[PDB]
Structure formats: C-alpha cells, structure tokens
Amino acid sequence: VNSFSGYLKLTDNVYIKNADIVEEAKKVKPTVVVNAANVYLKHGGGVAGALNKATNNAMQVESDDYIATNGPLKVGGSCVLSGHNLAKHCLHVVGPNVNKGEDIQLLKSAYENFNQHEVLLAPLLSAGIFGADPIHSLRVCVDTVRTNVYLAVFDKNLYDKLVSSFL
C-alpha cells in the first residue's frame, strides 16, 4: 500500500493522474521523483524548470556541481541526485528531444532507467517541450517499465486523450 491518491490504473504496474508533478511531489514526498532532464542538467523549462523552481534553485546548484565533476549525461541515460523538498531522490532521466533531432528509439532506453527503482512519480518522458507524441511515450512506458510508476500529466485535455486512446 502506498500514499498515491486518485490514480487511474492502466496496467498491473502503471498508473496515471491529471496532476501537477510539483504539487504531487510536495504532497506525497515520494522516494523517487523523475525529472525530464537534458544532458547538461540545465533545468530551464518544462517539467525540469518547474521542479527546479520549486526547490528554490537548489536542484540547479547541485546539478551544476554534478556536471562539473562528471560531465554530461547520455541521451537515454540518468543520474540519481537529491530530491530536495520534493522527494527523497530525484532521478534525472534524459529522453530524446525531437526538437533537437534525437533518435526516438532512445525513448525505450530512457524508460529502462525507471526499472532500477521500485516506485516512482514521473512525467511522460520526451513529452511536452521535448516534442515527442505523448501517446507514443505512454505506450513505450507501459511496454518498458516493470516497476510501479505513477504518471502525472499536467494538461487535463491531454490526460483525457491519453486515457481515451489507451490500448
């Protein structure tokens, strides 16, 4: 039993809710919140900018030290950093950014990072300003992630479409 409320169950392990991931993180304080990161961990917009803002820029400060030590992530890769005031941990996952021409097949590799964590609060990878089709992203999520994932979808119109079109 966990503390996530109001989710629709899509499969054995995938749940979805129309919610602001920042507000959901602030209320649940999950073990892991997933960030829609880029390889530089520059949290300027989209989910990343919102999560970083909610940490009063502490996420960005920690991220800049991580990059200075380790260099950029790979597209499809991830790193575990602090969750600050939002979660125990933040899993920064780099989905491909279609608006940069990155290979959409890397989306499956990106979702594979979720399997290293038993339970996660997460956005749809590569959705929003990353330019992928969120319906495709949801399909890859369901077909790749085997651990328990609670997806927060900010846009109500998109949430309903995602639900209504889900196979």
Ligand SMILES: O=C(Nc1ccccc1)Nc1ccc(C(=O)N[C@@H]2c3cccc(O)c3C[C@@H]2C(=O)O)cc1
């Ligand atoms: O800024 C906050 N919250 C907040 C921050 C500071 C203080 C208080 C509250 N939230 C927030 C901001 C942006 C996003 C976001 O870009 N969504 C994306 C979106 C939008 C439309 C269609 C989409 O396919 C997607 C993908 C992504 C998502 O829905 O996952 C999501 C959440």
